[PDB]
Write an enzyme that holds these catalytic residues in place. Structure first.
Site, PDB file in Angstrom:
ATOM      1  N   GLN A 172      43.941 -23.679 -17.756  1.00 45.36           N
ATOM      2  CA  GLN A 172      44.947 -24.277 -16.886  1.00 45.36           C
ATOM      3  C   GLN A 172      45.443 -25.606 -17.437  1.00 45.36           C
ATOM      4  O   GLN A 172      46.644 -25.839 -17.587  1.00 45.36           O
ATOM      5  CB  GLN A 172      44.362 -24.510 -15.492  1.00 45.36           C
ATOM      6  N   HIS A 176      49.256 -26.396 -19.151  1.00 47.76           N
ATOM      7  CA  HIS A 176      50.190 -27.251 -18.421  1.00 47.76           C
ATOM      8  C   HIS A 176      50.846 -28.341 -19.248  1.00 47.76           C
ATOM      9  O   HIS A 176      51.598 -29.149 -18.699  1.00 47.76           O
ATOM     10  CB  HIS A 176      49.517 -27.882 -17.189  1.00 47.76           C
ATOM     11  N   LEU A 353      53.479 -14.800 -18.031  1.00 48.24           N
ATOM     12  CA  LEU A 353      52.228 -14.094 -18.263  1.00 48.24           C
ATOM     13  C   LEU A 353      51.017 -14.961 -18.473  1.00 48.24           C
ATOM     14  O   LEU A 353      49.938 -14.458 -18.762  1.00 48.24           O
ATOM     15  CB  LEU A 353      52.386 -13.090 -19.420  1.00 48.24           C
ATOM     16  N   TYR A 354      51.190 -16.263 -18.312  1.00 49.00           N
ATOM     17  CA  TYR A 354      50.066 -17.163 -18.465  1.00 49.00           C
ATOM     18  C   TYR A 354      49.608 -17.582 -17.077  1.00 49.00           C
ATOM     19  O   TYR A 354      48.822 -18.515 -16.919  1.00 49.00           O
ATOM     20  CB  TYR A 354      50.455 -18.369 -19.318  1.00 49.00           C
ATOM     21  N   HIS A 357      46.073 -16.798 -12.379  1.00 46.29           N
ATOM     22  CA  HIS A 357      45.506 -17.266 -11.137  1.00 46.29           C
ATOM     23  C   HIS A 357      44.291 -16.467 -10.664  1.00 46.29           C
ATOM     24  O   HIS A 357      43.434 -17.003  -9.947  1.00 46.29           O
ATOM     25  CB  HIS A 357      46.619 -17.360 -10.091  1.00 46.29           C
ATOM     26  N   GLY A 495      51.313 -11.460 -25.365  1.00 46.07           N
ATOM     27  CA  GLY A 495      50.994 -12.876 -25.417  1.00 46.07           C
ATOM     28  C   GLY A 495      50.403 -13.503 -26.667  1.00 46.07           C
ATOM     29  O   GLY A 495      50.558 -14.707 -26.866  1.00 46.07           O
ATOM     30  N   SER A 499      51.151 -17.075 -28.263  1.00 44.39           N
ATOM     31  CA  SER A 499      50.087 -18.045 -28.482  1.00 44.39           C
ATOM     32  C   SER A 499      49.941 -18.502 -29.940  1.00 44.39           C
ATOM     33  O   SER A 499      49.847 -19.700 -30.209  1.00 44.39           O
ATOM     34  CB  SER A 499      48.741 -17.490 -27.992  1.00 44.39           C
TER      35      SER A 499
HETATM   36  C1  HEM Z   1      42.612 -23.831  -8.549  1.00 42.37           C
HETATM   37  C2  HEM Z   1      43.439 -22.785  -8.871  1.00 42.37           C
HETATM   38  C3  HEM Z   1      44.904 -22.861  -9.015  1.00 42.37           C
HETATM   39  C4  HEM Z   1      45.797 -23.220  -8.056  1.00 42.37           C
HETATM   40  C5  HEM Z   1      45.529 -23.635  -6.637  1.00 42.37           C
HETATM   41  C6  HEM Z   1      47.111 -23.129  -8.704  1.00 42.37           C
HETATM   42  C7  HEM Z   1      48.279 -23.410  -8.082  1.00 42.37           C
HETATM   43  C8  HEM Z   1      49.501 -23.357  -8.628  1.00 42.37           C
HETATM   44  C9  HEM Z   1      50.738 -23.724  -7.824  1.00 42.37           C
HETATM   45  C10 HEM Z   1      50.779 -24.188  -6.373  1.00 42.37           C
HETATM   46  C11 HEM Z   1      51.806 -23.557  -8.744  1.00 42.37           C
HETATM   47  C12 HEM Z   1      53.319 -23.869  -8.340  1.00 42.37           C
HETATM   48  C13 HEM Z   1      54.180 -22.732  -7.747  1.00 42.37           C
HETATM   49  C14 HEM Z   1      54.421 -21.535  -8.660  1.00 42.37           C
HETATM   50  O1  HEM Z   1      55.000 -21.750  -9.780  1.00 42.37           O
HETATM   51  O2  HEM Z   1      54.115 -20.370  -8.240  1.00 42.37           O
HETATM   52  C15 HEM Z   1      51.161 -23.080 -10.063  1.00 42.37           C
HETATM   53  C16 HEM Z   1      51.804 -22.781 -11.286  1.00 42.37           C
HETATM   54  C17 HEM Z   1      51.253 -22.380 -12.497  1.00 42.37           C
HETATM   55  N1  HEM Z   1      49.845 -22.173 -12.716  1.00 42.37           N
HETATM   56 FE1  HEM Z   1      48.480 -22.422 -11.348  1.00 42.37          FE
HETATM   57  N2  HEM Z   1      47.063 -22.712 -10.043  1.00 42.37           N
HETATM   58  C18 HEM Z   1      45.684 -22.550 -10.231  1.00 42.37           C
HETATM   59  C19 HEM Z   1      45.142 -22.146 -11.450  1.00 42.37           C
HETATM   60  C20 HEM Z   1      45.798 -21.852 -12.633  1.00 42.37           C
HETATM   61  C21 HEM Z   1      45.134 -21.456 -13.863  1.00 42.37           C
HETATM   62  C22 HEM Z   1      43.598 -21.229 -14.048  1.00 42.37           C
HETATM   63  C23 HEM Z   1      46.155 -21.282 -14.798  1.00 42.37           C
HETATM   64  C24 HEM Z   1      46.140 -20.919 -16.200  1.00 42.37           C
HETATM   65  C25 HEM Z   1      45.629 -19.749 -16.831  1.00 42.37           C
HETATM   66  C26 HEM Z   1      47.339 -21.559 -14.093  1.00 42.37           C
HETATM   67  C27 HEM Z   1      48.569 -21.510 -14.658  1.00 42.37           C
HETATM   68  C28 HEM Z   1      49.776 -21.811 -14.005  1.00 42.37           C
HETATM   69  C29 HEM Z   1      51.142 -21.764 -14.676  1.00 42.37           C
HETATM   70  C30 HEM Z   1      51.315 -21.379 -16.144  1.00 42.37           C
HETATM   71  C31 HEM Z   1      52.002 -22.125 -13.701  1.00 42.37           C
HETATM   72  C32 HEM Z   1      53.518 -22.275 -13.823  1.00 42.37           C
HETATM   73  C33 HEM Z   1      53.862 -23.720 -14.213  1.00 42.37           C
HETATM   74  C34 HEM Z   1      55.371 -23.973 -14.230  1.00 42.37           C
HETATM   75  O3  HEM Z   1      55.903 -24.344 -13.180  1.00 42.37           O
HETATM   76  O4  HEM Z   1      56.031 -23.804 -15.281  1.00 42.37           O
HETATM   77  N3  HEM Z   1      47.164 -21.899 -12.817  1.00 42.37           N
HETATM   78  N4  HEM Z   1      49.751 -22.977  -9.913  1.00 42.37           N
HETATM   79  C1  IM8 Z   2      43.666  -8.603 -34.238  1.00 43.07           C
HETATM   80  C2  IM8 Z   2      45.157  -8.510 -33.799  1.00 43.07           C
HETATM   81  C3  IM8 Z   2      45.393  -8.457 -32.266  1.00 43.07           C
HETATM   82  C4  IM8 Z   2      46.887  -8.428 -31.938  1.00 43.07           C
HETATM   83  O1  IM8 Z   2      47.208  -8.118 -30.597  1.00 43.07           O
HETATM   84  N1  IM8 Z   2      44.700  -9.575 -31.569  1.00 43.07           N
HETATM   85  C5  IM8 Z   2      44.983 -10.888 -31.667  1.00 43.07           C
HETATM   86  O2  IM8 Z   2      45.966 -11.356 -32.278  1.00 43.07           O
HETATM   87  C6  IM8 Z   2      44.043 -11.762 -31.011  1.00 43.07           C
HETATM   88  C7  IM8 Z   2      44.303 -12.354 -29.611  1.00 43.07           C
HETATM   89  C8  IM8 Z   2      45.042 -13.470 -29.270  1.00 43.07           C
HETATM   90  C9  IM8 Z   2      45.712 -14.353 -30.285  1.00 43.07           C
HETATM   91  N2  IM8 Z   2      45.034 -13.694 -27.902  1.00 43.07           N
HETATM   92  C10 IM8 Z   2      45.641 -14.733 -27.279  1.00 43.07           C
HETATM   93  O3  IM8 Z   2      45.497 -15.860 -27.712  1.00 43.07           O
HETATM   94  C11 IM8 Z   2      46.464 -14.597 -26.025  1.00 43.07           C
HETATM   95  C12 IM8 Z   2      46.561 -15.728 -25.133  1.00 43.07           C
HETATM   96  C13 IM8 Z   2      47.318 -15.663 -23.935  1.00 43.07           C
HETATM   97  C14 IM8 Z   2      47.994 -14.462 -23.603  1.00 43.07           C
HETATM   98 CL1  IM8 Z   2      48.909 -14.377 -22.150  1.00 43.07          CL
HETATM   99  C15 IM8 Z   2      47.906 -13.333 -24.480  1.00 43.07           C
HETATM  100  C16 IM8 Z   2      47.150 -13.399 -25.683  1.00 43.07           C
HETATM  101  C17 IM8 Z   2      44.270 -12.715 -27.304  1.00 43.07           C
HETATM  102  C18 IM8 Z   2      43.902 -12.438 -25.961  1.00 43.07           C
HETATM  103  C19 IM8 Z   2      43.083 -11.331 -25.745  1.00 43.07           C
HETATM  104  C20 IM8 Z   2      42.620 -10.488 -26.847  1.00 43.07           C
HETATM  105  O4  IM8 Z   2      41.798  -9.350 -26.623  1.00 43.07           O
HETATM  106  C21 IM8 Z   2      41.300  -9.040 -25.333  1.00 43.07           C
HETATM  107  C22 IM8 Z   2      43.014 -10.795 -28.195  1.00 43.07           C
HETATM  108  C23 IM8 Z   2      43.839 -11.920 -28.348  1.00 43.07           C
END
Ligand code: HEM
Ligand code: IM8
Ligand SMILES: *[C@@H]1O[C@H](CO)[C@@H](O[C@@H]2O[C@H](CO)[C@@H](O[C@@H]3O[C@H](CO[C@@H]4O[C@H](CO)[C@@H](O)[C@H](O)[C@@H]4O)[C@@H](O)[C@H](O)[C@@H]3O)[C@H](O)[C@H]2NC(C)=O)[C@H](O)[C@H]1NC(C)=O
Ligand SMILES: *[C@@H]1O[C@H](CO)[C@@H](O[C@@H]2O[C@H](CO)[C@@H](O[C@@H]3O[C@H](CO[C@@H]4O[C@H](CO)[C@@H](O)[C@H](O)[C@@H]4O)[C@@H](O)[C@H](O)[C@@H]3O)[C@H](O)[C@H]2NC(C)=O)[C@H](O)[C@H]1NC(C)=O
Ligand code: HEM
Ligand code: IM8
Ligand SMILES: *[C@@H]1O[C@H](CO)[C@@H](O[C@@H]2O[C@H](CO)[C@@H](O)[C@H](O)[C@H]2NC(C)=O)[C@H](O)[C@H]1NC(C)=O
Ligand SMILES: *[C@@H]1O[C@H](CO)[C@@H](O[C@@H]2O[C@H](CO)[C@@H](O)[C@H](O)[C@H]2NC(C)=O)[C@H](O)[C@H]1NC(C)=O
Ligand SMILES: *[C@@H]1O[C@H](CO)[C@@H](O[C@H]2O[C@H](CO)[C@@H](O)[C@H](O)[C@H]2NC(C)=O)[C@H](O)[C@H]1NC(C)=O
Ligand SMILES: *[C@@H]1O[C@H](CO)[C@@H](O[C@H]2O[C@H](CO)[C@@H](O)[C@H](O)[C@H]2NC(C)=O)[C@H](O)[C@H]1NC(C)=O
Ligand code: BOG
Ligand code: BOG
Ligand code: BOG
Ligand code: BOG
Lengths: 553, 553
Positions: A172, A176, A353-354, A357, A495, A499
């Protein structure tokens, strides 16, 4: 006159372009195919196509050779595979970037206006029969329903790979720094200019804020001494904006660089680790270059953290996420012979796709305690009370949920999820199947083949009406997963290219920057070369807790 | 403790870095040399060094084979040489960029803050004995004296190559799209972000101004009909800022995109040609893609002009400037196999050496008339009176002065020249000889060897005291020229790497962009592929005058 590009006639990345009023042509330039819609493979493509194994097959080779891999890992093949792993991946993302929410064609504006996020596929022509092109029902499934029905968690399904909460936060936090959709400018725009791992979530994303957090002496950063422990300085010394709820802006109200990092203990936790790390790197430099100034000492440390991050993210973060026996490796020199563009531009499809949640638990165990969300969210004293050490331990031991499979997004944050589905349509992202293609895959031919079952598949068909109408976010999260995979095939294939293009697309990765002088001395370099998660924590703490991206035992 | 990096101990691009208080080390990474200061050549460098001919020798091969060249030009060798000509050149400029007026080391700020100009060599350490390092007199020659003495024109020496005024303006115009030192922010900073051939001197360098000049219909641009001829619209319709002197802001006070283009008839002339061209490209597109909108039609035309410019600039502009029998060629595909970074960042040393003020005549012949500077400068009616046609003719027939050799900068603009020398020191650019090295050349060993004579050489030694103290600008302009060369050896060798890295460093040059779809249709592409100076003019005029980069006959 149905916009002919509504059918998505061009294949293999051929560009659709309207001519006249009702005609069109595909630009199959360098697509490796020729003909009307780019379906007639050139000589090598044909070979490349026939001598090319399925993604799922490869996944199997990578997740099985217990022995074969200790050998390869122990040989040079390790490099050959990494270097191959890279190039092929990164080749799938356009560079310079291509489109944005404004233009579905190449424009000098899209190239120069950093404010915009970029897209891989053009948007859905805003004049097509169906919301997704041609197939499907006149209106899409209520994102509220669709979410509760399939993404809402019932019984918490933990991650088959042992992924833990100490990982979920790093994830997370780290993401961000490039994901900051400008609420003000709206969706498809980003406050986080820089687009890479510039760390604009520590040193802030504007020069003032940097100067606000910056303690202009020995290159270090401002900070307070609570309990004898170092933490981010409070706004009562770091006059920078945040989002702490209307409570005690004085103490406990810390400054970090990412306005929103006050909201959860995990982020503040990490921000602390990094901040306490940076100031730690400064110390080392000042010893090496006593004649140095503040500007340098600072900058040299910023580069040293951009390195250490890219290092850990690849050799540990992705290593754990992958489940690969092939030991991943970070060494910029692997790409020095290839044709690589050292420049990244975050895409909106990446952003979507990141949204992991569902990694989030049910409650938050912290030793004998067990805070609910209500006690955890916005808690502004948990960090300083417990002590990083003790907190790190508590996250590195609590399982994190499985991202894929469906129905695993807790009920609290389940709104974020409906928003991503709601905004996904605002942006007009093409159907799931189109993104499958564009990323070298075969479109699913039924909801049946998509979902690892038949029950959900039934309700889905009934909503979307056709597989070709399924949406980007909902698809990804409802796709069948390989057993013991944190998520499905598409998540991995779609993804990874984003990445890696990012991680390695960083200027410090280029031949030009990757010298020992850039990190002032040999000491800077080795720090970037041997960085670890265990070292990021236990080096900046009193006691060495248990830190890792997967639960112990 | 003399900053050891004041001697410039590191060679071949090795990075000097202070360690301790009085020590230092060179980072000879990838310099092809090893040892304390990078002077011990690796195996190939040694070969590369011995089997490498002098720059002057090559110049001779390129300016002599009357026959040998018609053959090569007629064969594939033409490409091999071009492709070779490129890569080698461009390899001499760092990328991503390296330093700025703020940092003499790699920093994430220098990489991200577009506002800064970048430098090739670090600045002069601000604590060295002499203003230039170690050698020289405690104070530099009065830039006023030094200018009058050597750069002030006495008898106008025209260009041995037939270069004309129709060229001098194109040069001025074209370069001002990346040269815009922010008076406000000061030297070393640029309003012209974009850094390439983005044409922010037509469509303006900010989005509003674009919208101000933009006539939001069929993608075209605003304009007025004076005499039945098309010209830039006046501010009384294009509410955009300019710098026209306090006279008649109403009519005759035109809007262009480069605030300063009102000041001289030549620029307004060109701005008109381009503006009248763009709107011309729009027409063609609208016929091809009638369903298209305004945004596209516009953007597609902007790309088509970025192409046509890069085309003409290379195959004609540099062709004439070079004096080469090898016919230069513009084809982005030549670099598709190489390792090239599609990203350019204007440097301050480039800016300095593009100050070709001596190209400017004594007066301005325009048929029977013969305006002085007083009648020419700021004249706001010469353009519309005469008619582009008639004006173009008049510049394509009047010789342009020689840039090198010394003493050829007219007395009027001679101040610009003292400013470049004055600012050159503000920036703290290293001595001439250091730039000779850094660009693969041997430092001159005496003012004698520098200047193609002995008289000037005498006065110079007497001023600077040592060859190693000579300045960047004054050197370049006082260097001996190959007979029939518009300028000296250094100008050619130092600036070509900057020019090509720029021209080809444009995103439209990358594999990603260089498709026919990017210029909407095959029509866009061919326009970029067959663009000419003769076509840029005679296509947008009534009568076809005499246009060329060299005087007729
Ligand atoms: C404690 C848990 C979490 C809470 C309460 C939370 C809450 C939120 C809220 C309220 C938003 C704003 C509204 C929306 O865009 O839908 C958001 C956006 C986002 N969250 Fe979370 N989140 C959590 C965990 C995570 C985690 C673990 C990740 C990463 C893998 C993550 C990645 C994101 C991303 C990428 C966005 C979009 C940011 C943008 O506006 O461009 N979140 N989250
Ligand atoms: C060996 C080639 C093969 C190609 O697909 N794997 C790789 O390149 C390895 C590889 C990379 C680089 N990952 C990412 O960092 C990644 C991060 C965020 C999103 Cl949302 C999607 C992917 C993986 C995530 C999961 C995974 O297995 C379960 C492999 C990988
Ligand atoms: C590219 O870099 C340039 C140059 O660094 C950026 O412009 C410059 O930006 C800075 C800060 O944004 C301006 O700051 C100046 O510094 C004084 C001193 O500050 C005082 O002392 C400390 C500093 O934090 C505090 O404790 C005090 O409260 C107080 O702030 C500041 O007070 C002034 O505001 C002053 O402007 C600098 O002047 C500015 N100008 C230039 C060009 O030099 C530029 O923004 C950046 N480009 C981009 C768009 O990123
Ligand atoms: C990256 O692109 C974004 C999006 O394009 C930039 O932000 C946007 O910038 C534009 C112009 O700077 C803002 O303009 C809006 O348009 C109305 C309409 O203008 C009116 O009609 C015409 C237009 O010229 C004129 O004849 C009239 O006099 C009048 O101007 C304008 O009136 C408003 O000012 C309005 O803001 C747009 O709103 C703005 N916001 C976003 C994010 O959409 C962004 O600057 C750019 N990034 C950078 C830094 O280059
Ligand atoms: C009619 C003749 C010309 C006049 C009167 C003129 C005048 C000026 C003046 C007053 C400045 C500002 C002060 C300074 O920086 O010294 C300047 C800058 C400059 N001129 Fe000219 N100039 C002329 C022709 C040219 C030509 C033909 C070229 C191009 C080869 C040229 C290139 C430049 C550059 C590159 C700058 C610096 C721009 C910057 O500020 O970054 N000039 N000129
Ligand atoms: C054939 C290789 C040889 C390398 O030095 N020549 C070339 O690369 C060709 C070449 C390039 C690219 N020029 C530039 O555009 C240029 C533009 C502005 C400045 Cl301030 C400096 C140079 C030349 C200018 C002059 C010239 O002869 C007299 C050759 C070239
Ligand atoms: C914020 O977190 C603190 C813990 O740091 C919470 O206080 C603890 O609450 C538990 C029971 O919930 C007690 O047993 C601990 O002794 C408390 N710690 C102390 C001494 O403060 C607090 O309740 C949380 N606040 C919120 C937002 O609910
Ligand atoms: C601006 O340029 C005009 C030419 O377009 C100058 O006017 C001309 O001046 C000559 C003699 O200098 C006359 O023979 C022409 O007939 C004039 N043209 C006309 C009819 O205007 C004018 O003098 C210039 N102004 C300045 C700045 O000196
Ligand atoms: C390229 O893709 C189009 C998109 O459908 C194909 O479709 C056209 O031709 C089909 C068979 O002749 C028809 O089913 C469609 O109605 C028709 N639609 C369009 C967009 O014209 C087209 O045949 C494809 N080209 C080929 C020959 O493979
Ligand atoms: C590297 O460059 C330095 C810069 O002058 C050389 O100079 C040092 O040694 C010289 C001869 O021993 C002396 O003339 C200088 O006083 C001395 N200065 C410095 C900067 O220490 C140095 O020898 C070079 N290295 C070698 C051995 O070639
Ligand atoms: O790993 C491989 O990476 C390649 C590059 O994306 C793809 O073509 C394959 O499907 C994928 O499995
Ligand atoms: O064996 C492999 O096993 C995988 C996992 O069972 C399958 O999905 C692949 O199609 C198959 O090639
Ligand atoms: O052309 C050549 O280009 C090369 C690349 O700059 C240089 O090494 C030579 O001196 C130059 O003459
Ligand atoms: O012959 C060449 O002629 C040139 C021009 O006369 C000389 O400068 C070169 O050194 C020489 O190699």
């Amino acid at each position: 006159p149905v916009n002919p590009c509504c059918y998505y006639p061009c294949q293999h990345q051929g560009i659709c372009v309207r001519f006249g009023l009702d005609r069109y042509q595909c630009d199959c330039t360098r697509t490796g195919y020729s003909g009307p819609n780019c379906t007639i493979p050139e000589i090598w493509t044909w070979l490349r196509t026939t001598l090319r194994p399925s993604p799922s097959f490869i996944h199997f080779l990578l997740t099985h050779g217990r022995w074969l891999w200790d050998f390869v890992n122990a040989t040079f093949i390790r490099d050959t595979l990494m270097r191959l792993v890279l190039t092929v991946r990164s080749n799938l993302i356009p560079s310079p970037p291509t489109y944005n929410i404004a233009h579905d064609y190449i424009s000098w504006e899209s190239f120069s206006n950093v404010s915009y996020y970029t897209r891989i596929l053009p948007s859905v022509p805003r004049d097509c029969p169906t919301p997704m092109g041609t197939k499907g029902k006149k209106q899409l499934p209520d994102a509220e329903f669709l979410s509760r029905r399939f993404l809402l968690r019932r019984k918490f399904i933990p991650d088959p790979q042992g992924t833990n909460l100490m990982f979920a936060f790093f994830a997370q936090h780290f993401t961000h720094q490039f994901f900051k959709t400008s609420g003000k400018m709206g969706p498809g725009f980003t406050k986080a200019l820089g687009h890479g791992v510039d760390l604009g979530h520590i040193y802030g994303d504007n020069l003032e804020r940097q100067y606000q957090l910056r303690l202009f002496k020995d290159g270090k950063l401002k900070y307070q001494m609570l309990n004898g422990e170092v933490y981010p300085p409070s706004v009562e010394e770091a006059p920078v904006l945040m989002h702490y709820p209307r409570g005690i802006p004085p103490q406990s109200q810390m400054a970090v660089g990412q306005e929103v990092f006050g909201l959860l203990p995990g982020l503040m936790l990490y921000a602390t680790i990094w901040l306490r790390e940076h100031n730690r790197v400064c110390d080392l430099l000042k010893a090496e270059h006593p004649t140095w100034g503040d500007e340098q000492l600072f900058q040299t440390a910023r580069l040293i953290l951009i390195g250490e991050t890219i290092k850990i993210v690849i050799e540990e973060y992705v290593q754990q996420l992958s489940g690969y026996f092939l030991q991943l490796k970070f060494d910029p020199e692997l790409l020095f012979g290839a044709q690589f563009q050292y420049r990244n531009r975050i895409a909106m499809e990446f952003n979507q796709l990141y949204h992991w949640h569902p990694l989030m638990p049910d409650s938050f165990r912290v030793g004998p305690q067990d805070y609910s969300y209500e006690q955890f969210l916005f808690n502004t004293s948990m960090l300083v009370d417990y002590g990083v050490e003790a907190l790190v331990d508590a996250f590195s031991r609590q399982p994190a949920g499985r991202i894929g499979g469906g129905r695993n997004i807790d009920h609290h944050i389940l709104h974020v999820a409906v928003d991503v589905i709601k905004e996904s349509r605002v942006l007009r992202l093409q159907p799931f199947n189109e993104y499958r293609k564009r990323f070298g895959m075969k479109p699913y031919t039924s909801f049946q083949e998509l979902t690892g079952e038949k029950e959900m598949a039934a309700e889905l068909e009934e909503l979307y009406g056709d597989i070709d109408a399924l949406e980007f976010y909902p698809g990804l999260l409802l796709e069948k997963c390989h057993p013991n995979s944190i998520f499905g095939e598409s998540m991995i294939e779609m993804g990874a290219p984003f990445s890696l293009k990012g991680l390695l697309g960083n200027p410090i990765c280029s031949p030009e920057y990757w010298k020992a002088s850039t990190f002032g001395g040999e000491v800077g370099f080795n720090l970037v070369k041997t960085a670890t998660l265990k070292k990021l924590v236990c080096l900046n703490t009193k006691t060495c807790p248990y830190v890792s991206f997967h639960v112990p035992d």
